[PDB]
Amino acid sequence: DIGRSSVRPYLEECTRRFQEMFDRHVVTRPTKVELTDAELREVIDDCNAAVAPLGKTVSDERWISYVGVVLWSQSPRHIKDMEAFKAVCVLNCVTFVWDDMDPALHDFGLFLPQLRKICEKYYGPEDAEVAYEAARAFVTSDHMFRDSPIKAALCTTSPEQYFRFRVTDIGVDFWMKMSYPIYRHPEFTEHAKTSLAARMTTRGLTIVNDFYSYDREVSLGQITNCFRLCDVSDETAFKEFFQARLDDMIEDIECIKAFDQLTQDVFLDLIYGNFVGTTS
Amino acid sequence: DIGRSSVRPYLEECTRRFQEMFDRHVVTRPTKVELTDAELREVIDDCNAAVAPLGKTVSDERWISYVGVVLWSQSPRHIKDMEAFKAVCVLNCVTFVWDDMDPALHDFGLFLPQLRKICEKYYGPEDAEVAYEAARAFVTSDHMFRDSPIKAALCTTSPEQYFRFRVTDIGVDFWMKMSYPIYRHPEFTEHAKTSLAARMTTRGLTIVNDFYSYDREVSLGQITNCFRLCDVSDETAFKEFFQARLDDMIEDIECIKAFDQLTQDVFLDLIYGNFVGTTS
Numbered sequence: 001d002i003g004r005s006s007v008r009p010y011l012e013e014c015t016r017r018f019q020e021m022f023d024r025h026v027v028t029r030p031t032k033v034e035l036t037d038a039e040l041r042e043v044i045d046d047c048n049a050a051v052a053p054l055g056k057t058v059s060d061e062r063w064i065s066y067v068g069v070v071l072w073s074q075s076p077r078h079i080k081d082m083e084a085f086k087a088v089c090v091l092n093c094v095t096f097v098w099d100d101m102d103p104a105l106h107d108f109g110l111f112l113p114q115l116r117k118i119c120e121k122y123y124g125p126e127d128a129e130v131a132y133e134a135a136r137a138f139v140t141s142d143h144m145f146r147d148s149p150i151k152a153a154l155c156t157t158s159p160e161q162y163f164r165f166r167v168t169d170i171g172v173d174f175w176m177k178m179s180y181p182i183y184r185h186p187e188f189t190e191h192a193k194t195s196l197a198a199r200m201t202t203r204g205l206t207i208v209n210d211f212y213s214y215d216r217e218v219s220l221g222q223i224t225n226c227f228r229l230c231d232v233s234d235e236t237a238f239k240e241f242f243q244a245r246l247d248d249m250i251e252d253i254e255c256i257k258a259f260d261q262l263t264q265d266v267f268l269d270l271i272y273g274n275f276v277g278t279t280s
Numbered sequence: 281d282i283g284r285s286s287v288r289p290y291l292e293e294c295t296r297r298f299q300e301m302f303d304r305h306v307v308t309r310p311t312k313v314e315l316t317d318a319e320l321r322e323v324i325d326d327c328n329a330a331v332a333p334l335g336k337t338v339s340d341e342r343w344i345s346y347v348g349v350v351l352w353s354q355s356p357r358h359i360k361d362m363e364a365f366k367a368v369c370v371l372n373c374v375t376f377v378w379d380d381m382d383p384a385l386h387d388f389g390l391f392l393p394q395l396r397k398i399c400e401k402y403y404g405p406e407d408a409e410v411a412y413e414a415a416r417a418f419v420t421s422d423h424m425f426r427d428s429p430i431k432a433a434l435c436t437t438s439p440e441q442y443f444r445f446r447v448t449d450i451g452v453d454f455w456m457k458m459s460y461p462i463y464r465h466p467e468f469t470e471h472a473k474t475s476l477a478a479r480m481t482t483r484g485l486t487i488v489n490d491f492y493s494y495d496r497e498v499s500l501g502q503i504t505n506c507f508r509l510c511d512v513s514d515e516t517a518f519k520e521f522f523q524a525r526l527d528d529m530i531e532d533i534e535c536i537k538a539f540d541q542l543t544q545d546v547f548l549d550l551i552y553g554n555f556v557g558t559t560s
Contacts, residue, residue: 129409137473144470153538160440161535168474190424194417194448195475255441258433 003221005232007214014211014242015279021246022272025253028265030273033076035067039086043067046090046121050114051097054107058097066093072277074182075269078262084181087122091115091135091178095171098139103146112136119178127181130193134177141168155223159248162226166206169224173198175270188263197267200259203252204271207245212278283501285512287494294491294522295559301526302552305533308545310553313351313365323347323369326401330374330394334387338377346373352557354462355549358542364461367402371395371415371458375451378419383426392416399458407461410473414457421448435503439528442506446486449504453478455550468543477547480539483532484551487525492558 007014035043044063051058070092079085098111115135119128145151154165167173176192183189191197210217210225214232217225230241249271256267287294315323324343331338347369359365378391395415399408425431434445447453453475460472471477490505494512497505510521529551536547 133473137470140470141474141476144467149538153535157535158531161531164479165476167479168476173475187424190417190420193413194421195453196421196445196448199444199447251437251441255433255437258430 001233002228003218005218007211007227007232007238009235010232010238010242017242017246018208018275021249022275025250026268026272028268028272030072030269030276031076032068032071033074033079033085035071035089039082040064040067043086043089043093046086046118047093047097050090050094050118053110053114054098054101054105056097056101056105062097063093066096068280069274069277072280073270073273074179075266075273077265077269078183078185080184081181083122084127084179087118087131088175088178088182090118090122091131092175094118095135095139095174099142103143106143108139108143111139115139123181131178131181134174138168138171138174145169152223155225156229159226159229159245162229163203163206166224167195167198167202170202170206170209172202172205176201179266183262183266185262185266187260188266191259191263197263200252200256201267201270203245204249205274207249208271208275208278282498282508285494285498287491287507287512287518289515290518290522297522297526298488298555301529302555305530306548306552308548310352310549310556311356312348312553312557313354313356313359315347315351315369319362319366320344320347323366323373326366326370326398327373327377330370330391330398331377333390333394334381334385336377336381336385342377343373346376349554349557353550353553354459355546355553358463358465358545360464361462363402364407364459367398367411368455368458368462370398370402371411372455374398375415375418375454379422383423386423388419388423391419395419403461411458411461414454418448418451418454425449432503435505436509439506439509439524442509443483443486446504447475447478447482450482450486450489452482452485456481459546463542463546465542465546467540468546471539471543477543480532480536481547481551483525484529485554487529488551488555488558 044060047063048057067089070089074085074088094115098106116132119132119135122128123131151165151169154161173195176195176197180189180192180197188197191200207226210227214225214227218228226245227238227241231237253268253271256264259267324340327343328338350369350372354365354368374394378386396408396412399412399415402408403411431445431449434441436442456472456475456477460469460477463469468477471480487506490507494505494507498508506525507518507521511517533548533551536544538544539547
């Protein structure tokens with residue numbers, strides 16, 4: 001049953017309603033950042049360099065698909081450091097190539113040094129330690145938690161426990177901690193470093209992500225998906241659950257608007273830009 | 281109206297129901313870490329050194345009351361590094377003094393290097409950076425959010441938003457990131473570094489602390505308390521709310537039990553030791 005269930009019947013309407021929510025609560029539309037050809041060149045090279053020692057080649061095309069969500073989910077209004085921006089591009093793609101691999105191919109001895117190399121190139125000395133630590137902590141978490149009892153408990157107990165897990169596991173804390181040098185904005189730097197930035201954005205990112213990867217994830221027996229907490233085959237149960245998650249997103253967005261303007265801009269562009277890049 | 285609210289009519293019974301919950305769900309009871317006189321002498325000397333540049337005078341008796349909850353909330357069976365332990369005593373104590381002070385006296389240029397000096401004495405060079413950064417982030421958060429509209433938003437919107445703010449603001453992330461070297465336990469160390477450790481323990485700490493500081497904090501106009509989210513003068517409302525927070529503590533404690541045995545001992549001794557140190 002559960003591996004054969006599907007949110008396909010709700011695809012069009014839920015997509016419609018995500019967009020309607022965003023239109024009514026965020027209003028500002030996401031924009032894609034512009035990478036010059038040199039910029040796009042350096043990124044893919046740094047990506048291949050970091051993944052070579054692991055015995056993996058991946059196509060320019062696969063890279064570009066991965067970079068595209070970063071381009072959508074950042075906030076081009078406020079970019080001030082494009083080296084930081086390039087770092088975030090590379091570290092996102094390499095860590096998601098590392099995630100689509102087999103776990104037996106996961107040689108941390110080969111990998112963490114490449115992650116550290118990337119951070120050292122693009123970041124100042126202090127910022128590079130923050131980004132590297134968040135990357136290290138992210139990939140170690142994933143290694144610790146596969147087939148783990150903790151993961152089963154947090155992902156099956158309640159939305160609260162689940163989203164608590166995903167603050168790290170979906171990589172949003174990692175995202176904020178490598179992204180703040182892009183904006184060099186003091187308040188945003190602090191919210192990223194206290195992880196309040198991650199805590200405010202986790203549900204909007206996760207609920208969108210979970211919905212569009214449900215069918216692939218439950219067929220592969222993944223359990224990190226908030227929609228396994230409801231019976232998606234019961235339309236009345238699903239729609240009620242989906243409405244609850246939509247209220248979660250609204251409350252967070254309405255709370256995000258108490259932050260300073262620039263931080264707010266970055267938080268909402270991430271959430272709504274991720275929705276757009278996920279459906280492109 | 282909220283400034284003259286009180287939970288006193290529920291003092292006895294909520295204390296009783298806390299103890300019963302802990303007896304049923306943690307079972308293993310807390311023990312206080314016992315410092316030798318030399319160890320206590322060193323802690324107090326280090327505490328006084330750190331707050332001297334601020335001109336503050338703090339009695340031995342205040343230090344000893346402050347450090348006592350630390351002695352109740354750590355996990356003696358699992359201590360491996362008493363230098364780290366003394367570090368946590370000093371940093372907790374000087375932070376408490378720094379928060380009971382008048383904000384206008386808050387000189388970060390005099391205070392921050394004292395914190396760093398504490399961490400450089402007691403920690404290895406990496407752990408010292410992790411503990412300093414968490415201490416830095418904690419005190420900078422406090423300064424940022426005083427009279428902040430974000431704080432009003434998160435504290436008044438819902439229990440979710442309030443507890444999400446308190447992950448940092450009540451200091452438990454800070455606590456976790458200075459406490460893991462005490463135990464030198466690889467899995468605990470990672471949960472501390474992901475802040476999953478703090479997210480798991482925030483409610484049990486915060487709910488107990490909020491209840492016993494309610495009368496004082498509403499008398500001083502502080503909004504950082506979950507019980508201002510209900511009418512404490514309405515018996516029926518308060519007890520539905522109080523049961524809800526108890527279900528939160530219970531759900532967290534039952535999920536904590538899926539962690540590894542050392543990690544969950546530390547988590548549950550913190551929550552239940554904090555109850556006991558707070559009530560004496």
